[PDB]
Symmetry: C4
Subunit: 389 residues, 4 copies
């Protein structure tokens, strides 16, 4: 009955962003049984789109919320839940157990991947059709880790980018090509990106583009472009001087295409872009110093043009509100002739920026592109920290 999805369409023209989903999880969880989360994303099946994140295995009001700034424990799991509801104890479906994930539907069924273990002995389990199929042991014994947003499939082949090794020098990044949860091939990273974490990917016209985080050196973002038929890839950086990691230095006039733009070391944030010629939009935090604010900038030819500057933009979160990770997804099963770019922003609340509470959590806002030039609003998390004291 169902066939594997093929990436046959190009991106729709992005003239602005419209609201798609928002869960208000922190506001609602002040007085309801909402799980503490972080590292959220969005992903569609052929008949539904859902929110996803890594639970911390406690509610926000629960006493076990104390300590949830920590990224890795035995109490995390990848959960999904209905679009724009909050992640509650009673509506959250566990996809797999662990503290680093990705997930994508191939048109027939869903693959989900969760990594668990101690830092020196982690392993991935690849689930397909809600059953475990393949396992991969750590190859560098230092926090095996993956995208924290959806993967993308083409004719059953779903590439996934993993890293294992240091966060503050060269590491061992691998691109795995899965089909029905089995490994067809893997390759080591090639090209000019010097460090890769937390790739945010999308597909169009039989090519998958991933915008990642160079935690080690780069305040420009590395880009991996994957051919899922040939099962090959390239890597470079976004050439534009509109720098989109965080923290970062101020924007220069000329960026770097094949090396990290320097100025900030050993830090970053997961983020994304859509790189499609003149139809190119970059997300970034507004602040250069912290995970505050969020904006989209139209930067024609950002990938290839080392002097490209914005020609249009849209504020998503004011710089007086907290943001966080951000990532790409699309509804590959929508009607019409083109794929509509979407993204989400994780709105982090609690530690370390708001340390009067003992927890860290987030809510989600997400937007998709419009071919209209729509008015803009800002979309904060909306919770009052003082209510939790």
């Amino acid at each position: 009955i169902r066939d594997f999805n093929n990436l046959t369409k190009g991106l729709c023209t992005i003239n602005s962003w419209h609201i798609y989903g928002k869960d208000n999880a922190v506001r609602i969880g002040e007085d309801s049984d909402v799980l503490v989360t972080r590292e959220p994303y969005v992903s569609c099946d052929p008949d539904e789109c859902r929110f996803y994140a890594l639970s911390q295995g406690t509610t926000i009001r629960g006493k076990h919320s104390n300590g949830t700034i920590h990224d890795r424990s035995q109490y995390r799991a990848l959960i999904s839940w209905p679009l724009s509801s909050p992640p509650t104890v009673y509506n959250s479906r566990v996809e797999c157990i662990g503290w680093s994930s990705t997930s994508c539907h191939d048109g027939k069924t869903r693959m989900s991947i969760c990594i668990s273990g101690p830092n020196n002995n982690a392993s991935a389990v690849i689930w397909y059709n809600r059953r475990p199929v393949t396992e991969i042991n750590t190859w560098a014994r230092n926090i095996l880790r993956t995208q924290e947003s959806e993967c993308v499939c083409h004719n059953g082949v779903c590439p996934v980018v993993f890293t294992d090794g240091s966060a503050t020098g060269p590491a061992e990044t691998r691109i795995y090509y899965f089909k029905e949860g089995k490994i067809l091939k893997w390759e080591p990273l090639a090209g000019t990106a010097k460090h890769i974490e937390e790739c945010s990917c999308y597909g169009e016209r039989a090519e998958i583009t991933c915008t990642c985080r160079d935690n080690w050196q780069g305040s420009n973002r590395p880009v991996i472009r994957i051919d899922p038929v040939a099962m090959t890839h390239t890597s470079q950086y976004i050439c534009s001087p509109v720098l989109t990691d965080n923290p970062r230095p101020n924007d220069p006039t000329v960026g770097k295409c094949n090396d990290p733009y320097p100025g900030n070391n050993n830090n970053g944030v997961k983020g994304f872009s859509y790189l499609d010629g003149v139809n190119t939009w970059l997300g970034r935090t507004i602040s250069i110093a912290s995970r505050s604010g969020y904006e989209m900038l139209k930067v024609p030819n950002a990938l290839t043009d080392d002097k490209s500057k914005p020609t249009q933009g849209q504020t998503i979160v004011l710089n007086t509100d907290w943001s966080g990770y951000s990532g790409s997804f699309m509804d590959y099963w929508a009607e019409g002739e083109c794929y509509r770019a979407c993204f989400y922003v994780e709105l982090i609340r609690g530690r370390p920026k708001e340390d009067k509470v003992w927890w860290t959590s987030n809510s989600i806002v997400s937007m998709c592109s419009s071919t209209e030039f729509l008015g803009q609003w800002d979309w904060p998390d909306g919770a009052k920290i003082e209510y939790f004291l």
Copy 2:
């Protein structure tokens, strides 16, 4: 498999109203995780009827309920939930994000529309089959806004009435004709209605009738009648001297067919009527001054007869209980030979009438017509405000 619904039936004869649904949301939410709402309605799919409303993105007992008198924020969404259950965190399905909505099923799938943004830069997103399809930017830069109750479709064409512009003088009302979430046509309001907000619509014999709110001048209600095949409409007022907005002056002996009946300016409430010759019933608040009580009056030829008075009635909510918005819907997929008129009343609790609590919310009661002459009960919200202090 499924075909678009056609409005092939006339209304059943309304000889009284029977109880259809009631959620007791405020009573139950005193000690359960019920979302704060307002602007509720009811709408049917071919296999289920559901309650809908605009959440405020907090529970009633939650500390974020403080401030929920306010109509527009980034934390509102259109939600639906099973008939007569309350809107809870765990059972409420988000249809779209925003602070003004409508929704209707065309026989194949559902269209939902939500407007969001700041007052001077709002936009509608039209969702079809649970995906975003079309967007419309504000045309007058002043609170783009729509029905707050269900739309109606005929052979796939679902007209929707929007207003943008002042609430206290001429505004720019448009009737959009959607099919599969795409715009076939729109037209500016024509006819003699001088201001339109919050239309309540129903269909019968290939005609859609909408009873709306003239916020600017009129205490009689404007009526828009739409031909969804020709995609044309007319407008006038209910001619009857039984005035049905709120607040309003006392009832005269002769009303106005083609102009606002004066006496109250710059206010109103969403309401409804069924206008079908001798089979005409009007809803209204009992109080002329405030949103208290609710009654149905049988007013033969109310639309056309400027001296028409009641010949029968039914009390729905006593004048010592709070009411609120009211609106029309029908189950277009029921058995039998005629469409059974239904309506709901929003029972508003909290601010501004009950200001010992810091929140505003509501529950729902809803009734449908019977061809019997049934005994009447009154149907209050039923919550005790003192329990929330």
Copy 3:
């Protein structure tokens, strides 16, 4: 696809009773969002069996639980929920609004009936396939009321017994014959039963037997036997001197077949029996004075033999625990060659017997027959009232 169910089987031989379902609702609702209920029952669809009851439109821990001894309000509804779960805010499906009900599946879909209104102006609404179809106005203007347990259908015809009029003298009982929610016929009660309330019915070999409550005079129970093909009935009393209403006098040696067995006036409890020759079992409270304890007694030929005494029995609830209403149901869609008799007991907690709390609620236990002679346990509600203070 689906056909109407026919009553083609006889009862299985009842040699003891096994546990079927129990919800522990009061225990669990001490610290979860469980609705206050009373007047529960059980009813099966072709693919699932569910618990049903009349909600009071509040949780047990909620402040609106104060006052829930009262039987009739605008905040009651017939709800159903999964077998042996408790009736919670989040899992309870409302079937219809009102304070007296019955419900049954005909093999194609379900009919549910709810009565609402003030005592002098009540009305029934008959829902079929989850939509309202027919309405019936009060005929005697004194608490129109029905079974409070499931009805039974045969080839689409579902008879239902209603009463309207005094509870303490002659009233007007009617048997309605519904098909697809429409009235085929009704008849006034005939035969020798002198007053009827709250009938508990079951079907076998194309005959429906209902055991009811004579509130006015009788401590023996009236029995109505209905032919759903001819749409006729008879009535009499259980002849046995094993008296099964409550309160009641002590058991005599000879009962009454065609008149109320006297000794207690103007009170009773809903109850049931299976009347099948030697395979006859009667339920009753153990106490003659109050709704405490519950037992089944095998009383061969109880219906017809005015000296019949027990030959076997089973204790269901000890006389040191509270009971309440009880009623019959069967799974008419089970495998095998005979219908397995089942029943439920309502375990009432709170007022008036336990008046340190301000509420009245209940839980459910239910049993079905076995052809084995099984060991017996007792099945109390299990909640500690002191925990609610």
Copy 4:
């Protein structure tokens, strides 16, 4: 459409264990409506795998949690719920009522068995396709009891092991062979096992292997091997000197194949093994004295070789964390050419080891085998008891 499952595959090669599911129930239930449980397990249907356990009919934070160390009451039920969610009031489906259970899917539908009653008069009810079909009365009048983990079917025949009689001397164990919930045959235990409780079973190549608990004498575990076609069985003990009950004496150099290995009397814990030649893995608690820690040991030929020692292992729960019962299950409906061994560990919290709280409950962790040699983590319950004081 569906056919009965046949055990046509052998076990996959077990080279390590990967995380499969974990519910964090005690952590989450500190501030959400999680039921108190014990005696959990896991079982798959053709389209889903679920967690199961015996509820205690109260939440953990509820006042009725006081006293839940006790094993048998009228308020217990077998519940199931989605894999890795916690067992909550709102998501837990009751399978049947009682205080000892087993359940398995035959490829067409599920059989569930629950035993209830007082110790001297207990009875099993066998449910098939969610309806009661057969009942079995106590044969020895002393705590009729069964596996507390899943049964296994082959071509519709689902053997189940029961015991009735003393826990501290010879008892009466029976193997029942069910098909469609009916009894085809039963046999008394034969072979050399001298006492049997709480068998943990799995199937491969048309043979079912059960590893049980000799509560009376043995610190080695008894093994029952069942031929579900011939409906015959054998019994012996695991010959290995790697002793796997608890409490137990220290490991000797030579075990016992046909008699209990002595040293500890009248106690034990439910546990499991996979016995497949060199592909043999045994679970056990790390502590010899208490239910603390959990490890898997690869013990080639453990069943048959009375000097077999470990050649590989994996720690599952550190010896500074509490464990509990453990049991086997597999997904018999997975893809591929072999059945992947899985197990669960019950992580008991509260009494008697943690007696500052008044309750006993547990959470679940579960693992399945990998053909990789994966890094290991430990998987504690994760709750802080002090938060519950």
